[PDB]
């Protein structure tokens with residue numbers, strides 16, 4: 001039944017950017033929807049908002065660009081796969097931003113609110129009165145992951161507008177996550193996560209000295225790995241019950257600070273000791289499935 005707020009064994013994995021970067025390393029989204037251990041998948045990425053742009057690496061080969069927006073894709077296989085994964089009990093979020101989002105956000109709260117309403121009309125419930133293009137057709141995402149990586153002006157107003165629309169919606173629960181890097185405070189999404197309630201924060205504990213590679217096994221005195229800082233922040237955040245996922249690279253090619261073996265088991269045992277801990281996040285599906293035995297290491301570490 002997808003995201004489980006009462007579990008310490010949630011696993012969120014990104015799909016779409018083919019980090020492993022080979023012809024065969026990223027199968028279609030539904031290939032990965034028979035994995036009992038992966039209950040949340042983030043589709044990466046809507047890497048342009050105003051104007052809209054979608055990039056799904058070589059999954060774009062089975063999409064058709066919209067005639068009036070060549071950077072926006074119509075993706076019938078992703079549409080079908082979202083519906084299949086949802087039928088299979090997976091929570092499917094759309095990830096906004098990524099390291100290729102260059103638009104810098106919005107100059108006004110009004111522009112940010114309009115942009116949020118466009119994203120909601122494009123990926124939320126189908127709107128009968130709307131002319132907006134729908135990359136995933138009649139599929140409806142289960143929410144949004146905020147993975148902005150650079151200065152995004154008025155991201156707080158964008159997020160608050162999108163949260164307003166999901167809070168007003170019928171049908172199903174919509175989830176909000178954010179993917180800050182572990183450096184505290186986070187420059188890209190810090191203002192957003194201090195203003196807008198999130199269901200969980202999936203912290204990138206990699207590409208930075210505060211990452212899992214900096215964890216010191218055998219002690220609960222941690223000079224580098226800063227989960228404790230994030231837990232302290234969580235308790236007074238807009239959702240004081242917000243959960244944290246420990247985000248890690250799924251292979252040595254996925255990011256700096258890949259860990260495995262006893263370092264991996266130890267940092268997860270340490271993190272599991274905290275009331276906010278809800279499981280793991282991984283970048284990304286292509287790397288995870290190429291890295292034989294790594295998923296079993298992560299599953300075994302969360303037990």
Ligand SMILES: CC(=O)N[C@@H]1[C@@H](O)[C@H](O[C@@H]2O[C@H](CO)[C@@H](O[C@@H]3O[C@H](CO)[C@@H](O[C@@H]4O[C@H](CO)[C@@H](O)[C@H](O)[C@H]4NC(C)=O)[C@H](O)[C@H]3NC(C)=O)[C@H](O)[C@H]2NC(C)=O)[C@@H](CO)O[C@H]1O
Pocket residue numbers: 014017018019020021045098099100147148149179181183204206207208253254255256283
């Ligand atoms: C606080 C601070 O500024 N820290 C600096 C680091 O940010 C910086 O390294 C960069 O870190 C970000 C965050 O970890 C990283 O982007 C994420 O992580 C992966 C890579 O590990 C990215 O993956 C790429 O995504 C694109 C699509 O946008 C693909 O084209 C490509 O295949 C991916 N590459 C790989 C190898 O997987 C994601 O976009 C993003 N993930 C999420 C959840 O948003 C950047 O890639 C890092 N940049 C560089 C140049 O390494 C670090 C080094 O510059 O310095 C810190 O100080």
